[PDB]
Amino acid sequence: ILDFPFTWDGTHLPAQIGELAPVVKVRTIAGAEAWLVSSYELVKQVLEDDRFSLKNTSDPGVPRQYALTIPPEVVNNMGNITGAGLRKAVMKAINPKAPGLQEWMEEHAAELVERMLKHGAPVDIRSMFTDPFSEAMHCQILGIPHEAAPLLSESLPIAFMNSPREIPAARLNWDRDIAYMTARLDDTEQGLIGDLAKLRGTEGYEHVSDEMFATVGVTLFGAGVISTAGFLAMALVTLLTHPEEADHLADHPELMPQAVDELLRINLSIGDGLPRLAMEDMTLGEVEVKKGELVLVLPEGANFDPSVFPDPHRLDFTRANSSAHFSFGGGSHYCPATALGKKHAEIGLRAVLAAMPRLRLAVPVEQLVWRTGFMKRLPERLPVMWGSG
Template sequence: MAESHPEAVTFPSGRPGPFDPPASLGALREERPVAPMVYPDGRMGWLVTGYSAVRSVLADPRFSARRELLNVPVPFPMMREMRRPADPGMFIRMDPPDHTRYRRLLTAQFTVRRMKQLEPRVQEIAEERLTAMEKAGPPQDLVREFALPIPSLVICELLGVSYADRAEFQGATAVLVNLESAPEDIQAAIVRVGAFFADLIARKRAEPADDLLSGLVESGELTDEELSNIGFLLLAAGHETTANMLGLGTFALLRHPEQLAALRADPSLIDNAVEELLRYLSIIHIGPVRAALADVELEGQLIRAGEVVTVSVPAANRDPSRFADPERLDITRPATGHVTFGHGVHQCLGQQLARVEMRIAFPMLFDRFPGLRLAVPAEEVRTRDTMSVYGVRALPVSW
């Protein structure tokens, strides 16, 4: 355990509004972009908030993603059980060469051709959801009717999972990403997911199809346990992140009508708008977390081998040294360079798919419902503060 530090901070909490990170993150970034931090279990580590320092940590192989070395900056009931090596296939909690092996196999499946082929299907799915919303009439929960079904359907089709099974994995995922879930609920969700994927992988071996999981099965390089864990990782990440971007992004545009008007006036701004929403909203609001494998000097601070470092994506994405006037949502700004998808070897594998879904879904939503508006006062929209991926729990809308 690192020795205590008189100026140690705790992980900031308390958002001033639904789109803004805790104000103390910005103050820390300006004063101490690499600050000593006490973790909930009393161990000392570090919080990194400056853009350049965050990128340095994520790109430096001396910082490990291995699960057994890490800590969590917020209270989590399963922390002790988490401190063991990642199960086979859980590559996001591994370092090279193990991580490299899995990543190589998956990159071969996430081809540009396959992502391009998905565009017409994303359009079809979005059209189906919008038609269903229109037919049912207002008000509707945009999360349930639009933001969640689109990425869920897409990732199900990409992996070769029946969409009829979505309730099974969405329910389990909701438990696993909720930082307040009871340990027994987490264990039960893990068992359910394991049984679901064991059955699915057996079917893929018996009857392979033209989908990503079948491709991994046919590679012959992975065990059933590895396939099951990779399948769950991709399924959970593939619907959780984009669903929250679509829901929270719509909320943000409705609350910034001048930005929505600019997008309507110039649809070619959609690529910029997606990148700016990714930067501004920073839905990965807790971590990533890394552990130093050696002594590393980072912006004048000595981080000793074994110490755990939490980087703040929201703080880095609002660093004025990288983004001018960063507290303002501005869809005309070139917001590339944000760290919402991470950086380095662990950069998000599905980021191009997420971009495709957002570039298609946002314009279609606002074209279909030019009068889209919140159906409740903005302060009544409940956010996902206790979830590892930030967003809105529901977004009641009318038109």
């Protein structure tokens, strides 16, 4: 019996990945059977076929990867936002081209980096950079006060838990976070919450409750902040384990857009599978998947498939097909925020590398503490030091 996940240690690809058949039976954190899918070919096939349903992964009594920390219907969040007529408002808010946002992200990154320079080495670049940068950007696009980020952010280490059991803290924090966004609809003039407040009580939006409106602010803050802060921390882990490549990118800032594609391809921040329930009997490679069975898509399996990414462990900023990675998923549930995610990372990484020469890990790499029982692989602290000039 093979247990999934394999390890919370994000310093390199788990040894198990190179040994997997493209489709393997595993036992999940919740005790269920699942088909783990790890070849580039079959990851593509699952993500691009809607008979492998994300929505149905929260149906009553279905095999689970781990306990829900949200209402079951919120697994279909993007579908619900569309059905409620709120897709236009959401796509506008997550567009990095929104007026002033690029200049705001550049000034905020510059400001956080200057605070790290005034503090001096060593610093925890997660709590002084990746977290505050990701949090404040999400307050900015939601339209809410930046001083709300600490309190909403406090929910995140529990909200994205991968637990064998129901987490009582998840419901307490959800209700608190929903109440907070509900209050913001009454006093917010700008960004997404401002937009939603203008739609509320107008023709065509009679079917949208206050709770449904609030659920858009809570879910986009949570999914955006955990994925952006999670990626940027683990992009810094990649660069800190390849300091010659990190030095090269600091001297060639014109590489940054290509660099972010290769950092996404090589990233180890995904600590679980992308879940899909088989809505009918289906052949997947050499495996017969029965209706009702859970399928776990492993993006790191596809992204380190040597038949698509030759020498997959090599960090090659100029890899021609970097952007063919599955770190934003694929098919119908493809991440709607790729433009923002890529731009946020480019600005954040440029600010760090321009100002912190010869950036290095300030502790032995095997002295990092890895978060366990969590959707993302993440070091609890990321202490860094840097040269002078």
